[PDB]
Design a protein around this ligand. Structure first.
Ligand SMILES: COc1ncc(Br)cc1CC(=O)N1CCC[C@H](C(N)=O)C1
Ligand SMILES: [Zn+2]
Length: 139
């Protein structure tokens, strides 16, 4: 679990969105596993605007942060789950690292700010849904 709080927005994995998230829907994309809902309280997370390929992610299944090198956002094939059939997920970045299903929502950050959130994993690889292209999160 986990979210990014920026301005009047809440960014979560789409497969984990709540009833309140859908009732206050701003934007959602199944192909990216992202959902953004509006909030009354103001968020303070800084979104990174960069092309960094190194950062640190929070892994709740180990109560630890891990440094990783990650790929550039791209279309990656993701196995079927209870939330989606087998498909290509877009804007996905992979790193060699540990994750379990409950790790989705952990933040990946670089020196410039928040890069994305854990979205997929398996076989010793962790995938993060990039959010750096969503320029509107700041305005
Ligand atoms: C961090 O997730 C995981 N990590 C390790 C294993 Br094994 C398994 C996972 C779960 C995972 O990859 N999923 C399930 C939930 C929806 C996901 C999606 N974006 O399509 C795919
Ligand atoms: Zn950066």
């Amino acid at each position: 679990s986990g979210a990014i709080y920026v301005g009047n927005y809440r960014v979560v994995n789409r497969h984990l969105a709540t009833h309140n998230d859908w009732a206050n829907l701003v934007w959602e994309d199944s192909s990216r596993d992202l959902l953004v809902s509006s909030t009354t309280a103001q968020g303070c997370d800084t979104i990174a605007r960069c092309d960094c390929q190194t950062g640190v992610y929070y892994c709740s299944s180990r109560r630890k942060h891990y440094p990783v090198s990650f790929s550039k956002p791209s279309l990656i094939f993701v196995e079927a789950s209870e939330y989606y059939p087998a498909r290509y997920q877009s804007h996905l970045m992979l790193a060699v690292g540990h994750s379990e299903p409950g790790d989705c929502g952990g933040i990946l950050r670089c020196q410039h700010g928040v890069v994305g959130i854990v979205s997929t994993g398996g076989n010793g690889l962790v995938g993060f849904a990039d959010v750096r292209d969503l320029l509107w999160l700041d305005e």
